[PDB]
Amino acid sequence: MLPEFPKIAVVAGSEAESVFRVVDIGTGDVVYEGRLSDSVYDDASGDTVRHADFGEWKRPGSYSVTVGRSSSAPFRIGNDVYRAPLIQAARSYTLARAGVAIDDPVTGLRHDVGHAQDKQAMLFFEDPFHRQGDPIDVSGGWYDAGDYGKYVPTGAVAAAQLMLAWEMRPELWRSLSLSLPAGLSEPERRAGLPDLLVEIKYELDWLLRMQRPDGAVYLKVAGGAWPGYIRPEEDTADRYVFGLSTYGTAQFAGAAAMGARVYAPFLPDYARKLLDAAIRAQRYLEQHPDPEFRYDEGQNNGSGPYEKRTDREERFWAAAELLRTTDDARYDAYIREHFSDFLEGKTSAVFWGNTVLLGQWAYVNAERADADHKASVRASLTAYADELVRWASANGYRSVLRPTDYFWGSAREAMGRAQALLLADAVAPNRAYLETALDQAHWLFGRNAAGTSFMTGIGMHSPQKPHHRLVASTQTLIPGLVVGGPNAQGGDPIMDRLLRESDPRVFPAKAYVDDWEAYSVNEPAIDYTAPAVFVLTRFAEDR
């Protein structure tokens, strides 16, 4: 917990108690005694919960909350408390790199070069630039999740969210070491690039390799079958380039246009390479206005589908990010002609299937965007943020999730909503936005009905058996990874059995188990961790 922010312990049950005591563990002295709030039933969990509010106690230290016969696990009040998880989450991307050997003394993660054969991955179909089966260098980038596939939509959206974390607090990140393992990114490190930007560039370099000469971008790199729980160097099967999509082409353009701005102070040639690539993608999109999602039979036999057959929110982001980076007012005209609805509303949390908020954020920060339309976008952001505050303020776990939000990726959604609250705070400062965003980090780290952190390596309870082939094959804890979170819709054989056999039925906020095969709730992904990095950036102490 931070000294200057709200402090509530959430207690499920304990209906009969009326007071609580905050005890300094080092002295045994009570530093704060108060009355518990009234018990209130929580629809998503089935829990009856109340609060111990001790926000006025601000002294750093280690404490426990006593209620009746029980005392909480120790917790910290301190200014420094979110720096370590931020660092862990950010450097988890390094440990997810494809195409390199890793020997990390921090975690002990060690593996030989994985997927070197991505340097000659075979195109799964014929296109105007390559025969079916022709090799393409699509090496590098990050493994997506617990598998070894590499997918443009989540790679672009994750890279963009990490770049927005950079832009939120560049001076924090300039002095933040990710303890990059030996041999990695040696030219970038010799050049003094901040470690976060070194890591993001590994993914941008790969995204650039997924673009064809006409500007369009392929969908993903993977094999024809899912590997077992094996080290990446053991996954020697042929690799393929699959798919072609307009929404992924637009997401690439958004990420590359953002990277052009972010990298320009450091690497003028690389920044211009990114911008030219972004504009080639945008020009492909302007010349091919209809959505496309290419599907060849078999392309999902060994990798996730990431299918979206419309693309408006992503085309909007591409154009708005280009507007922000280039200051070319022709992009404002284009946006106003085709995407006026996104200038007047429809804010929703960022994820790979809807980047409208990345576009809205670019637009409101664009010097050459129309002023009245920037005002409209700010109001869309604050209306959405106000709704999140209303929900969370009345929720016993101070959660921005409703019972119907417990589907695949709920933990991402909590942190994406927290991200939206912080973007709203940037355009229209409001302490409630900042506090509610921080409440979602409290939730993520275990203040929730499932009684577990959804970030590895953090919390009294955390995921120990994430559906993750590197963790499983090396039996090595990688901290800072965010798993999907509770999901009442099923999707893997463990959760499917739990949900169908349970009587009474599982409450949605508890639809979670820590098991290797529970991949509908317990698989980490780069686009789950990315909004958590963004949110923690705001609350990490600088030095």
Residue numbers in the entry: 1 to 543
What's written in the study?
J30, an endoglucanase with activity against p-nitrophenyl cellobiose (pNPC), which produces cellobiose as its primary product, was identified and analyzed from metagenomic data originating from a switchgrass-adapted microbial community. Its likely source is the moderately thermophilic bacterium Thermobacillus composti KWC4, and its catalytic optimum is 50°C. It is annotated as a GH family 9 member consisting of an N-terminal Ig-like domain and a C-terminal catalytic domain. The predominant architectural element of the catalytic domain is an (α/α)6-barrel structure composed of 12 α-helices arranged in an alternating pattern as is typical within GH family 9 as well as other families.
The substrate-binding cleft assumes the shape of an open channel. The interface between the Ig-like domain and the catalytic domain is stabilized by hydrophobic interactions, a salt bridge between Asp47 and Lys510, and seven hydrogen bonds between Glu4 and Arg431, Ile8 and Arg447, Asp42 and Asn395, Ala44 and Ala509, Asp47 and Tyr397, and His51 and both Gly396 and Arg398. The highly conserved acidic side chains of Asp147 and Glu523 are directly involved in the enzymatic catalysis. Glu523 acts as a proton donor, while Asp147 deprotonates the depicted water molecule for its nucleophilic attack. The carbohydrate ring in the +1 position is stacked between the side chains of Trp226 and Tyr519. In contrast to its closest homologs, J30 does not contain bound Ca2+ ions. In J30, the side-chain amino group of Lys308 forms hydrogen bonds to the Gly353 O atom and the Glu313 and Glu314 carboxyl groups at precisely the same site. The absence of this strand, and the associated hydrogen bonds that would connect it to β-strands 1 and 7 (J30 numbering) as well as to the catalytic domain, may contribute to the lower thermal tolerance of J30.
